[PDB]
Amino acid sequence: MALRGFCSADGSDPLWDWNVTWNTSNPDFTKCFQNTVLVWVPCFYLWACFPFYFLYLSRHDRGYIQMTPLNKTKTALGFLLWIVCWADLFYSFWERSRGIFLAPVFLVSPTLLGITMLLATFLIQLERRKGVQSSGIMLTFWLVALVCALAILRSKIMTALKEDAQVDLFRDITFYVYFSLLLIQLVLSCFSDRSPLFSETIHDPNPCPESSASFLSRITFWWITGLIVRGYRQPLEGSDLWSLNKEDTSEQVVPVLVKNWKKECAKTNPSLFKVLYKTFGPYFLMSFFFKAIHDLMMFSGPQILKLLIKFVNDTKAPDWQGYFYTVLLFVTACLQTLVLHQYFHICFVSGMRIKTAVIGAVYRKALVITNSARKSSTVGEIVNLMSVDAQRFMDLATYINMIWSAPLQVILALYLLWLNLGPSVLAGVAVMVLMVPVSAVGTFTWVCTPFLVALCTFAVYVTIDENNILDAQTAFVSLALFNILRFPLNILPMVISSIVQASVSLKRLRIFLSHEELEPDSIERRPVKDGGGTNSITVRNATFTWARSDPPTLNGITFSIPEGALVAVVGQVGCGKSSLLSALLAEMDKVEGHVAIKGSVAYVPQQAWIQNDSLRENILFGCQLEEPYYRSVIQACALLPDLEILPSGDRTEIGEKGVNLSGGQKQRVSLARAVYSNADIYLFDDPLSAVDAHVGKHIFENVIGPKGMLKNKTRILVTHSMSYLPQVDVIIVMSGGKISEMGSYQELLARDGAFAEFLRTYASTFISFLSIFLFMCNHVSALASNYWLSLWTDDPIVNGTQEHTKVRLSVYGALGISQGIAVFGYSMAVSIGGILAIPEVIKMFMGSLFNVIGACIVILLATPIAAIIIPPLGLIYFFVQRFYVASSRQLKRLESVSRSPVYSHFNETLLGVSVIRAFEEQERFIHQSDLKVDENQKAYYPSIVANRWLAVRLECVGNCIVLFAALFAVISRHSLSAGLVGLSVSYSLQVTTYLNWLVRMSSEM
């Protein structure tokens, strides 16, 4: 109790005295309210965020915009605001020093205002020091200070010119200067400054404008318009889309996730959710503070509706009060929009981010992991993992924040119902429980559902007791609250289902990513580790097996050979020569054994794989061009006859998505790639399996034979031939995975040992008018029913009831049952017409058109002057709708056609992981699979941006029609009953919802 003696010595300034600010015809805050609250509100608002912005901006340095004249003038005007707000204090000090005792308010509040102005100037300077041009806080701070100064200035102007008033002419001039500088600063701070000195734009010529746009453009999503209008005349395709903003790209997002996941693995199992929350979480804190605000505004709307309806029925309420409602509502609605679509977008963006991160991780954990530990089918269990269990993490972004908001709303709505209908909630909750369990007939019952719930609730309310009256207030507030509650009751189902399927997908992603089979960490040293050596093959105590749970198959393997002696391996059918070489690939699990290899080596499988591209690209595999290598790489392989028959020679799309080849052709192209790889020794797996006798002999004598070009290279090959063995000096013979004999062919032949036994054993060497009439009847019946409700809620209150209750309910039920009969009839008619000779699209298009038309006709009926705003809004609506519909199909086709390449590339990489890992080049494929997904995301992002643009435009149109349907019903309150104004005001929210549904569903088909 100090404010009375704080502001004036005696005390005659009761703060918020309702006898001056509310009840009069000239509302005005008390002098002390103006001096204290209207000054401290903006200062406290700015001081609250200064911590947060100093914490956030010091981590996001972007540029050094140096000395733009806007910065100079803003700093100068901030200093001028300081000097005036300090001169006010100095004049107060001079007055108190040599004059009348002065209240402490005049000696305290200007000090705080001056301090706030200094902080604003310093924040502008620091905001310039960092690379942010258009402030998102300076605009709002100046706006709030300007609103408060506007209130104070209105009070001062009204107080001035009453009659010869004796006023202090120092706190007038100074305040006018302060308000003028406030307006100047607010207008000035709406412009974007220069670009940062060293911006990210160095080579990209088409960057997305979101990284550099004014605050209003970001709020209203105005930077998409550039490609929407441009997307109307010339069809959109490919390169017209922008480039990503360097923070959604895969090469920037993925490393954070992979390092966090590997740190979590080291710390240990708990799922990656526990890290998935801590990597993309801090971007959700802005998706939770932007849902509570919109949620509060959604409920705060109908309270303003109730206040307006109560005021209308007050014939003695002061006029201006009405306006004070009809503005506030508008503003509130607008804020809700400018918050709701600032949440969705953020959420949506984060969801898209999730995708790339997972796509970055699974790929990077697929081509360098799980050596033979991959028992899930390559098709339908790994690429399908990517597709399904990563496309499910963009919906969970949208459906996660509802798990707390959707229930809350419900109960809060129910709470308000209790506060509205009181004991009638006992029947209202019963009717809602009846409606909870509640095809064309089904859809039309859903259409009539608002009528059904209204009829049931009103009937039970009027029949439970004779002590309750159905005035406009309770009826229309209940209608609005039911319309609000409808959406969460529809959203509560399938949200739990989405959470469940996302949990299943999370389990699958964990069970894949938690393989952790880092088998090729290091099992042997670098093959060609020393540049100089003598022995090619050396081995001792070699033990190798397919997996951990298999008995050993290789024991007592100990032999060696220098460089220069032709060596080949001979094994019986099923003896394990293929598995032996597979173990020799250094791609298996080793218990013990010492093996030495020397020389650069590449790989050639016995099951050749073809990358889906041209023959030339398959041969290149990274190199630019070396002409002699190509001219000498085809004659040796004898690919001239094979290249000539090809439809396009060395240009056709070989392999899959092209002309098929024989197995020998795949073998030949693999050998050509291998000999292009430029190694010193090579690995081959019987490449001449299907080659003809003459062709095989020619190929062997061309290169592989002693006269071949690669005779300078020691020979490492496998085969099961017989005529190819005698030319080999020493034959490596495996007997049950163990060496048989070592020595030259002459020595073993003279020995007459195992080889002699092998040779001896083998010895191989009327309705359209009806539909229109029924539609018109149904819609005019609905409009007449609403008009009848408006008339009924205006009945006089005599004898504790209305003028007559039974007849009103009887006729209400009568035309409701008539409407039900009509809807059943035209449902049957339209179903028969569709079956006898897509129909749903036309039905809902006509329904929504007629609903919007009926709402407009109701608005016109209430106040004819409303016809002022029906044309200009409608045109605007059209000039949005068309555009979006003409620029959302293309942005959907691009995104849908760009999705397949990433999955096809992942399947390609998964099929031939052995070959790419063998060639010691696994980084180009990562770049390719990152670029493809980056292109897909670059195509996908403008789709959601345009969706937000369209939604904001439609919401603004709906808010404008709300405001201009309340204005004309407040101006003419003296000739319109409460029912008319209540119905007209309640219909505009449904106008907004109908417009949004019509745009989203009807024309998009």
Q: Which residue numbers belong to the known binding site for ATP? A: 546, 571-578, 606
Spell out, one character per residue from 198 to 237, where the chain touches a copy of itself: x when CB under 8 A holds, - when not.
Answer: ----------------------------------x-----
Closer to a copy of itself by CB, 9 or 158: give it: 158
Spell out, one character per residue from 22 to 51, where the chain touches a copy of itself: x when CB under 8 A holds, - when not.
Answer: ------------------------------
Q: How far is the CB of 345 from ligand Y01 (least distance, A)?
A: 30
| DSSP β-bridge partners for residue 653 | 614
Contact set for a copy of itself, span 844-863 (CB under 8 A): 860
- Tokens (6 digits) for 945: 């941006």
Contact 170, 89 (CB under 8 A): no
Among ligand Y01, a copy of itself, none, residue 656 binds (CB under 5-8 Å by kind): none
Q: Which residue has the tokens 């010193």?
A: 680
Q: Does 739 sit near a copy of itself (CB under 8 A)? A: no
- Pick one of 9, 158, 167, 173: the residue that binds ligand Y01 (CB under 6 A): 173
Type of residue found at 221: F
Q: Does 172 sit near a copy of itself (CB under 8 A)? A: yes
Spell out, one character per residue from 542 to 581, where the chain touches ligand Y01: x when CB under 6 A holds, - when not.
Answer: ----------------------------------------
Contact set for ligand Y01, span 871-890 (CB under 6 A): 871, 874-875, 878
Q: How far is the CB of 72 from a copy of itself (least distance, A)?
A: 11
Closer to a copy of itself by CB, 309 or 970: give it: 970
Q: How far apart are CA 40 and CA 63, in angstroms?
A: 34
What is the chain's length? 1005
Q: Does 191 sit near ligand Y01 (CB under 6 A)? A: no
Among a copy of itself, ligand Y01, none, residue 641 binds (CB under 5-8 Å by kind): none
CB atoms under 10 Å from CB of 307, counted, come to 17
SS (H, E, C) 194-242: CCCCCCCCCCCCCECHHHCCCHHHHHHCCCCHHHHHHHHHCCCCHHHCC
- Pick one of 40, 86, 91, 176: the residue that binds a copy of itself (CB under 8 A): 176
Among ligand Y01, a copy of itself, none, residue 72 binds (CB under 5-8 Å by kind): ligand Y01
- Tokens (6 digits) for 693: 């006798």
Among ligand Y01, a copy of itself, none, residue 176 binds (CB under 5-8 Å by kind): a copy of itself
Q: Does 870 sit near ligand Y01 (CB under 6 A)? A: yes
Q: How far apart are CA 102 and CA 8, in angstroms?
A: 9
Closer to ligand Y01 by CB, 169 or 645: give it: 169
Q: Which residue has the tokens 């963009």?
A: 394
The residue number with the shortest CB distance to ligand Y01 is 871
Q: How far apart are CA 668 and CA 646, in angstroms?
A: 14
Q: How far apart are CA 738 and CA 684, in angstroms?
A: 21
Among ligand Y01, a copy of itself, none, residue 780 binds (CB under 5-8 Å by kind): none
Q: Does 753 sit near ligand Y01 (CB under 6 A)? A: no
- For the CA atoms of 10, 13, 19, 20, the dihedral, rounded to the nearest 10 degrees, stands at 130
Q: How far apart are CA 657 and CA 612, in angstroms?
A: 7
**What order do you get walking across the sheet with 559-562 strand by strand?**
559-562, 535-545, 589-597
Among a copy of itself, ligand Y01, none, residue 52 binds (CB under 5-8 Å by kind): none
- Tokens (6 digits) for 645: 């028959």
- Tokens (6 digits) for 713: 């290279």
Spell out, one character per residue from 821 to 860, where the chain touches ligand Y01: x when CB under 6 A holds, - when not.
Answer: ----------------------------------------
Among a copy of itself, ligand Y01, none, residue 663 binds (CB under 5-8 Å by kind): none
SS (H, E, C) 232-300: HHCCCCHHHCCECCCCCCHHHHHHHHHHHHHHHHHHCCCCCHHHHHHHCCCCCHHHCHHHHHHHHHHHH
Closer to ligand Y01 by CB, 173 or 784: give it: 173
**681-682 and 567-570 beta bridge pairing:** unpaired
Q: Does 177 sit near ligand Y01 (CB under 6 A)? A: yes
Contact 347, 397 (CB under 8 A): yes
Q: How far is the CB of 184 from a copy of itself (least distance, A)?
A: 5
Q: Does 269 sit near ligand Y01 (CB under 6 A)? A: no
Q: How far apart are CA 946 and CA 227, in angstroms?
A: 9
Q: How far is the CB of 15 from a copy of itself (least distance, A)?
A: 27
Q: Does 807 sit near a copy of itself (CB under 8 A)? A: no
Spell out, one character per residue from 66 to 105, where the chain touches a copy of itself: x when CB under 8 A holds, - when not.
Answer: ---x---x--------------------------------
Query: Which has the closest alpha carbon to 367: 212, 520, 576, 139?
Result: 520
Task: Provide φ and ψ at 647, rounded to 5°.
Answer: -60, -35
- Pick one of 66, 73, 678, 810: the residue that binds ligand Y01 (CB under 6 A): 73
Q: How far is the CB of 173 from a copy of itself (least distance, A)?
A: 5
Contact 153, 39 (CB under 8 A): no
Q: Does 173 sit near a copy of itself (CB under 8 A)? A: yes
Contact 848, 1002 (CB under 8 A): yes
**716-718 and 684-685 beta bridge pairing:** parallel
Task: Detail the residues annotated as belonging to a binding site.
Answer: 546, 571-578, 606
Q: How far apart are CA 979 and CA 475, in angstroms?
A: 10
Closer to a copy of itself by CB, 162 or 375: give it: 162
Contact 592, 754 (CB under 8 A): no
CB atoms under 10 Å from CB of 762, counted, come to 9
- Tokens (6 digits) for 136: 């998102």
Closer to a copy of itself by CB, 736 or 864: give it: 864
- Pick one of 9, 76, 500, 841: the residue that binds ligand Y01 (CB under 6 A): 76
| DSSP β-bridge partners for residue 322 | none
Closer to ligand Y01 by CB, 80 or 352: give it: 80
Binding segment for a copy of itself (CB under 8 A), chosen from 127-135, 336-344, 672-680, 968-976, is 968-976
Closer to a copy of itself by CB, 774 or 869: give it: 869
Among ligand Y01, a copy of itself, none, residue 500 binds (CB under 5-8 Å by kind): none
- Pick one of 44, 66, 72, 622: the residue that binds ligand Y01 (CB under 6 A): 72
Query: Which has the closest alpha carbon to 469: 809, 801, 929?
Result: 801
Query: Which has the closest alpha carbon to 290: 221, 330, 346, 251?
Result: 346
- Tokens (6 digits) for 591: 């218990």
Q: How far apart are CA 75 and CA 77, in angstroms?
A: 5
Closer to ligand Y01 by CB, 523 or 875: give it: 875
Q: How far is the CB of 151 from a copy of itself (least distance, A)?
A: 15
Closer to a copy of itself by CB, 184 or 710: give it: 184
Cα dist. 195→75, 185, 188, 423, 465 in Å? 19, 21, 17, 63, 70
Closer to a copy of itself by CB, 454 or 961: give it: 961
Closer to ligand Y01 by CB, 91 or 621: give it: 91
Q: Residue 325: CA atoms inside 13 Å, Cβ hemisphere, count?
A: 26
Query: Which has the closest alpha carbon to 366: 901, 903, 905, 913?
Result: 913
- Pick one of 2, 55, 161, 693: the residue that binds a copy of itself (CB under 8 A): 161
Spell out, one character per residue from 858 to 897, where the chain touches a copy of itself: x when CB under 8 A holds, - when not.
Answer: --x---xx-xxxxxx--x---x------------------
Q: E strands of 27-96, at which residues? A: none
Q: How far is the CB of 870 from a copy of itself (least distance, A)?
A: 7
Report the interface residues with a copy of itself, using CB under 8 A. Answer: 69, 73, 153, 157, 160-161, 164, 169, 172-173, 176-177, 179-181, 183-184, 232, 860, 864-865, 867-872, 875, 879, 971-972, 974-975
Report the interface residues with ligand Y01, using CB under 6 A. Answer: 72-73, 76, 80, 173, 177, 867, 870-871, 874-875, 878
